[PDB]
Symmetry: D2
Subunit: 123 residues, 4 copies
């Protein structure tokens, strides 16, 4: 976990995120998306539960990125929830929620759901 | 947004979270759950997209909490994705993902999904 | 369950669905939405798990509706997954997935997620 | 679509489902899971939106399976929402919701979410 988490990861879409897992459960870094209404790097902050594991389980973790930087303001934020698995072929398997700011009338369709798998190798 | 977000919020289950929305999109605070394998307060970090809004839209935001503190280690993390609506009856409407650390064999059932609505009044 | 499920239900948005729970786990009926790219009634088919319950649990069930009829073809389908609770104030609590037909390029944003609560009374 | 949908499909976990897409949007068949609290075949019913597509889009569809047959009664149901893509390497990409019957107290953790990809070849 923690050490194993620190570094650069890439997913199936071609996004990249560089994160640092600090000693007490914090995750800090940047996310650069390949698709969407995103452009350049965005700031990401999150948490992981280590003290994870005498039965080779993954470490649970999650992070958030608001799609606003000095080039684009997409009026939305995405949160990724999943677990890290270390080893030869370490990966982070997640499911994500992307919510857009809407009017109360279209709030019912404000969130998209999907999944991403990240590897230390691209892809 | 930001100012409107800062403060104490409560949801339908009885949880409470106190957050501070910093000038550049950061959310920091603590979460105390009423249900679950949680006990006391946990640290939460997240982000919001303001610069939100000439058509009364909500501000998109999200946060993460790892369920580990000095009393309990649940080996899991939850991320909430949603939007803030200010006004007389301001609220944050979210959908959440709770992932548990599992073995590769039970990873397919590692995540629960649900929804929570927070108000400045309880509830 | 089954008997208790048969009838007309209404949700928070104002949609209505009339369903018949057949003896062996089948659900058949029509759905009329209030929001969306829907217009009139659409056909719905689904299943429930009864033989549900010596500890007052809800009955698990789910259904699907494709948003095509003789007035509109929205190129999408929604599935609702949840449980029925009977009693004075019986209700069906669900979470739903709405998927739209897209090109491989926008498949990552093809699904919206949300939740609906149905009562025998409107609302 | 429809014709292309009819047949036997397999997913990443090793489950199999045989379905028949009828002329007017109905899907009928059986599902046999490889993981879970399932054993043998279960009945599945659902719908698809064809009249799908001058821009090579997928056809939206969804189905439900209640995990009860003459060998097991898991007190739960799963709904799959996604789209079919035909061609050399045709597939159905979905996201699913699995809800279990619980007491009102544990209803907040009654649903798991995940994703499955089905191919005509295993896997
Ligand atoms: O990397 C990305 N994954 C997907 N989810 C999301 O929020 N934007 C897309 N980009
Ligand atoms: O406040 C809470 N909401 C629910 N989601 C979650 O992660 N734990 C439960 N507690
Ligand atoms: O009744 C409805 N609920 C929402 N989900 C959906 O698919 N369309 C909307 N209509
Ligand atoms: O085929 C399966 N996919 C997963 N989702 C589900 O409901 N059970 C598991 N089996």
């Amino acid at each position: 976990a923690e050490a194993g988490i620190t570094g650069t990861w890439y997913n199936q879409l071609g996004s990249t995120f560089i994160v640092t897992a600090g000693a007490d459960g914090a995750l800090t870094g940047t996310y650069e998306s390949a698709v969407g209404n995103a452009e350049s790097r965005y700031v990401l902050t999150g948490r992981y539960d280590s003290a994870p594991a005498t039965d080779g389980s993954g470490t649970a973790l999650g992070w958030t990125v608001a799609w606003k930087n000095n080039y684009r303001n997409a009026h939305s934020a995405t949160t990724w929830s999943g677990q890290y698995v270390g080893g030869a072929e370490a990966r982070i398997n997640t499911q994500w929620l992307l919510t857009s700011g809407t009017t109360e009338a279209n709030a019912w369709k404000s969130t998209l759901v999907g999944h991403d798998t990240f590897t230390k190798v691209k892809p």
